[PDB]
Design a protein around this ligand. Structure first.
Ligand SMILES: *[C@@H]1O[C@H](CO)[C@@H](O[C@@H]2O[C@H](CO)[C@@H](O[C@@H]3O[C@H](CO[C@H]4O[C@H](CO)[C@@H](O)[C@H](O)[C@@H]4O)[C@@H](O)[C@H](O[C@H]4O[C@H](CO)[C@@H](O)[C@H](O)[C@@H]4O)[C@@H]3O)[C@H](O)[C@H]2NC(C)=O)[C@H](O)[C@H]1NC(C)=O
Ligand SMILES: COc1cc(O)ccc1/C=C1\CCCN=C1c1cccnc1
Ligand SMILES: COc1cc(O)ccc1/C=C1\CCCN=C1c1cccnc1
Ligand SMILES: COc1cc(O)ccc1/C=C1\CCCN=C1c1cccnc1
Ligand SMILES: COc1cc(O)ccc1/C=C1\CCCN=C1c1cccnc1
Ligand SMILES: COc1cc(O)ccc1/C=C1\CCCN=C1c1cccnc1
Ligand SMILES: *[C@@H]1O[C@H](CO)[C@@H](O)[C@H](O)[C@H]1NC(C)=O
Lengths: 205, 214, 214, 209, 211
């Protein structure tokens, strides 16, 4: 049975990858859903106006080409694969000051409806003036995320909620979160889309 | 003699043939219909740094991982009584066990080579330096600071990867005697948790270390 | 229309295969077949100015544009595809280098180019660069001035020529709360004669005048 | 041209026409000789109890599968090749605190008797309390090196001398070397019956005056 | 058409040299190689008196010649030279002997090959090396030195030479924290008591002081 279930999974992976994606186009556009889980504000450097965040970046999209019928593959409804084995979106912070550091494996989960969920943990340094962090009102910084090379005609971006997930925020961080929002923005001949991460924070008093 | 020389060549041939049969002739990872149990254990070697400016602590440890696969089994009698072999971890599937609250990418300090035994068991023990979220307030006190970090599969839920420990006591037999920090206690405990992100329970091992300035 | 989508992917896959697999990699420019690369900078931030080492760290987007006959197609042969995105590793890219960096440049963005059916390519890497700069005067009204040349490392002006669209650096994305304010930022094509080499190299000289924000 | 052809033929014969060496085993064990040449103690950090060393690590071993008759190859007696082209031992510091950094090319010299000499230059941070370094008596630290995954029944270790080579130690280092030894140790765990082998590098050092 | 034939000729040349020959196995006693080395010092970035490490930025010019890289330009549309990734060809294992961190490469690594088989390769590098900067804040300044040479080849396999013993200072950064008093690059033949073979290095000696 286990031999058969393994064989089924190997067969599924082969048919989807080997017996056949060039990325989205205006004729075949994709929607990427983005969500942040903020874990920690590690450092806020007033000498350079750089702040360092650690977060999980949840990315989800769906491809017709990743759809299968579970009945054809021993009731398998999902599988895991290295993110290097599939196309992934070029979602980038627009105002980072150092290359993003990847903290987790980079493995995606593919479901039989064609949906892909990819949640890399990252540490990001970005442009931020932390003046006011030691006051009741705190400091506010923001950073936009979006595709580097695809317009809104090829990749639409969206959020499921504008409330950043703070359920995993480190309780003993040097900084307390007053608010954290993630808001889709459209800028205008093709539309350009980003998600603006806005964090208000202050010294844990 | 020549016989002994031949026996060495045969031994090499048998090992090359075993590795070929296991890897070349014939694992896509665990599934709900074939879940895998990974045993984890930590050997803490040193608390290198406890940074109160950022609430990051840096640990050096060996992370022992064990699992067993039917697909790595062989009969030693078919292979010159070979009972185990060493192979680059890149040659086999390995679990995606990750710290949940690191603050910098984990750094690997050792070769990444696994030992595979004829019963299909694998043992893999990478040495790592990890920076993780920890408030070291109280490190300059009798009772010390207490920090914790969860380790588990990144992408497999408890439907596919289960974890276990052999003991809840961290191996402190190799702890650096002249570290800046002395260890008061170090435990490793399996936990089953749900996250609002996702409907399936994930398993982790929670490493909890209580330490103070020496 | 799910089939029109399938047809559009097939057409793009076929185009890329034709340009990349059923055609051999462009060997780079030569004196018989020189290339003009258009360069433009968008300065985002002066992050750090180190007076102990005389190094300054910039974050910028470097726009590169060139055109190759070998990347041309007829859109009518490929379902009216007029352009596509592809990893910059799939195509030749120019070896444009800062001539006075003090650390390897760090890439901040995906390295993906846009190729258009007339054979034109646009590639816009975001970078952090440390370069040689004495920031003396940064704490004064007149500020500090530093300069850095960008150009091909190995191709002379007989092989790679450069041009700009304007000599004004794009400051429309400069971080408003930077520690440093920009007084001026220019980008100027130069023909550079080096005593080592009989052929001159073309560069774009980026000159930035800046001061500590008030 | 014939000398070049002879060498290309030798390498092809050794690397293409004859099987892989799969590493040592209980039935085909290997002796690895280790020696250190200490070049500099760069940094001794008393805030973290880490010391940084720069050294050359000489490794030697011999394989029947790397032997040839020079007479068959225009009297070539040795050659140099990328260490990636051949099996190399997984010799590791046991108490490093950062990944070792390689400072040189990693190229092995193979001799016709099957012996291999591989001498990477390395910078290593390791666990060390430098207390006493600002005293006449100095500080003492130690680090063990050995195979990560092979027991003494698969890889034995040996030194040619127990004196660390100090002939290349940097004359204007912040630290002077009082002594440096490299000593083979055999330990037996309760886990297992086979012996486990390391070479313990012990350095006594003090701030230069 | 002229340009298509020129590209075709170049693609054919590279194919013939690389794709269609057995890889050059490096020099030997019977087929020794001369490598010419020269340095262009661009900046002393940092001089650390707490660890006695100094950081230099320099261009390292390397030139050698291989018969296996020769061609008759008449057979290839009169192409006389080309540029190629340094990873496409053998390069000499020239290394600093007293670095303290891995050298960092600042430029592309692309070589120029000429029809006579000569190769020119000039990587820009940042190097940290062992240096006591005592005296840097004095009129006499400090003096440091670092040897460069093959890691594994003797003087009977790789000879090193310089064209000049004067380091190229023409591109030295005029506003560096440190000014250069002198910089020389001297070929040295070293013997080791083990072995009768000569071993060759180029000793880079820099005298410098705070500007
Ligand atoms: C690769 O390396 C091998 C090993 O060195 C070379 O083989 C040797 O080649 C030399 C040169 O031809 C030979 O030297 C000659 O030896 C003769 C004696 O031969 C017998 O005794 C020797 C020594 O015990 C035995 O090893 C050998 O098997 C024989 O039993 C001498 O009579 C010769 O002297 C005369 O010739 C020289 C010039 O060559 C004159 O100057 C002298 O004055 C005199 O007239 C000579 O010394 C040697 O025998 C070979 N040794 C072996 C083991 O074969 C290869 O030639 C070398 N290169 C190549 C391409 O193979
Ligand atoms: C030269 O590049 C720019 C200058 C500006 O002043 C503003 C935006 C961009 C490009 C951007 C912005 C962020 C999304 N990515 C790009 C981009 C655009 C085209 C190709 N590659 C990248
Ligand atoms: C966006 O993801 C999360 C938000 C939370 O608030 C808490 C946990 C996770 C996911 C985790 C926890 C770490 C181990 N695995 C995951 C995960 C789950 C699914 C896919 N990839 C990663
Ligand atoms: C030895 O090389 C140099 C010495 C100098 O004093 C100044 C400049 C260069 C090279 C340069 C400068 C322009 C960019 N490219 C080169 C170059 C020249 C030849 C080969 N590779 C790189
Ligand atoms: C969990 O591993 C250990 C705990 C201890 O308390 C002591 C030693 C080791 C293993 C070591 C020590 C260093 C050499 N290699 C190993 C090892 C042993 C087996 C497999 N992989 C690595
Ligand atoms: C352990 O090796 C040495 C000890 C010393 O005290 C001095 C020199 C060397 C080797 C050197 C010198 C630097 C260049 N390369 C070698 C070398 C020699 C043999 C194999 N690999 C490297
Ligand atoms: C190259 O030069 C030679 C002689 O100078 C000439 O005969 C030949 O036709 C020229 N062109 C080509 C493409 O070989």
């Amino acid at each position: 049975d286990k031999l058969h279930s393994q064989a089924n999974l190997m067969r599924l992976k082969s048919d989807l990858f080997n017996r056949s994606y060039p990325g989205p186009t205006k004729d075949d556009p994709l929607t990427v859903t983005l969500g942040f889980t903020l874990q920690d504000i590690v450092k806020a450097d007033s000498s350079t106006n750089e702040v360092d965040l650690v977060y999980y970046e949840q990315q989800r999209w769906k491809l017709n080409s990743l759809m299968w019928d579970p009945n054809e593959y021993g009731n398998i409804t999902d599988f895991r694969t290295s993110a290097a084995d599939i196309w992934t979106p070029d979602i980038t912070a627009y105002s980072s000051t150092r290359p993003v550091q990847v903290l987790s494996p980079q493995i995606a989960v593919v479901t039989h409806d064609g949906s892909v969920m990819f949640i890399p943990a990252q540490r990001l340094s970005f442009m931020c003036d932390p003046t006011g962090v030691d006051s009741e009102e705190g400091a506010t910084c923001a950073v936009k995320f979006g595709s580097w090379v695809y317009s809104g005609f090829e990749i639409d971006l969206k959020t499921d909620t504008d409330q950043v997930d703070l359920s995993s925020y480190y309780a003993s961080s040097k900084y307390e979160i007053l608010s954290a929002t993630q808001t889709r923005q459209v800028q205008h001949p093709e539309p350009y889309i980003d998600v603006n991460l806005v964090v208000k924070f202050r010294e844990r008093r």
